[PDB]
Amino acid sequence: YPVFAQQNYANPREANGRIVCANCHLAQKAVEIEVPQAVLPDTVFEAVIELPYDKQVKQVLANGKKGDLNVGMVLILPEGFELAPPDRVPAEIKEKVGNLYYQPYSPEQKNILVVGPVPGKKYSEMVVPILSPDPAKNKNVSYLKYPIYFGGQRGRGQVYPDGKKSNNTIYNASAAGKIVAITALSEKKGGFEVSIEKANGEVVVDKIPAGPDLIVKEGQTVQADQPLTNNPNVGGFGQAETEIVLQNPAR
């Protein structure tokens, strides 16, 4: 979630341009962003973002069942640019934005906006009202062509802040050996326990949460780190970059 990024990463964009959501949402899925080529100072403009995905395909949920996907994003604007205050956003734009609550990454980074999680069904496309700065009043900005960075996220991640894998990723054999048993946990918690007999006779038990499907069978020999399941992840994170020119009013 955006909060996972906020609580664990001071800056959402790394030196090489990678946005931190990618450290946990391990699958790539394209996104799109559009902003006007240019904007006058102290003016409200729209950033239209696209987070496409097949809405017919459900994902594995935290509870092990299948369900809809939720989305979120992080938008990195040039210093000085900020979310347009409600009083500056015309009715026609507020309607396009819908019931979304964009928030600054931190009180000290009002130029970085986030949103989510929100339903993918309704927000696979979003509009963000942005207010441009004024070089005449802000010396941290000038009349330049500035870059804008975007990260669009869909679906549950593969690893948590604590480093533990979620049930929405691949599970691998902890050791090489012969699978001597594949036990179904319960019927309410789901999941499995895969017993692997090593060459020395020791038996290790790999626990697999409900969600992923097994691709191995009893009696089958596996190598260390060999996948025991499929890759249930159907979501993805994508990045895009664009630009905008802050116009210099002439009179």
Give the bridge partners for 179, in sequence order: 196
Site for ligand HEC in 109-128 (CB under 6 A): 114, 116-117
Exactly one of 26, 33, 74, 148 binds ligand HEC (CB under 6 A); which one? 74
73 binds ligand HEC (CB under 6 A): yes
71 binds ligand HEC (CB under 6 A): yes
52 binds ligand HEC (CB under 6 A): no
Which tokens belong to 221?
């020999």
Cα 205 to Cα 217: distance, rounded to the nearest angstrom: 14
Nearer to ligand HEC, 23 or 111 (CB): 23
Site string for ligand HEC, 163-192 (x = CB under 6 A): ---x--------------------------
72 binds ligand HEC (CB under 6 A): yes
Other C-beta atoms lying within 10 Å of the C-beta of residue 108 = 9
Site string for ligand HEC, 84-103 (x = CB under 6 A): --------------------
Exactly one of 153, 229, 233, 239 binds ligand HEC (CB under 6 A); which one? 153
101 belongs to an annotated ligand binding site: no
Site for ligand HEC in 183-242 (CB under 6 A): none
Which tokens belong to 85?
């205050």
Nearer to ligand HEC, 115 or 216 (CB): 115
20 binds ligand HEC (CB under 6 A): yes
Please say whether the beta carbons of 67 and 55 come within 8 A. no
Exactly one of 78, 80, 129, 155 binds ligand HEC (CB under 6 A); which one? 155
Provide the CA 74 distance to its chain's centre, in angstroms: 9
Residue type, 3: V
**Share of the chain residues as helix, strand and coil, in percent rounded to the nearest 5:** 10, 35, 55
- The alpha-helical segments, DSSP class H, found in the chain are 2-8, 91-97, 120-123
> Residue 23 Cβ, how far from ligand HEC at the closest point, in Å?
5
Return the residue matching tokens 């804008």: 148
Distances (CA, A) of 154 to 107, 120, 157, 159: 25, 7, 9, 15
Exactly one of 31, 70, 123, 238 binds ligand HEC (CB under 6 A); which one? 70
Cα 215 to Cα 139: distance, rounded to the nearest angstrom: 60
Cα 38 to Cα 36: distance, rounded to the nearest angstrom: 5
- Residue numbers in the known binding site for heme are 1, 21, 24-25
Binding stretches for ligand HEC (CB under 6 A): 1-2, 4-5, 8, 12, 20-21, 23-25, 62, 69-74, 114, 116-117, 151, 153, 155-157, 159-161, 166
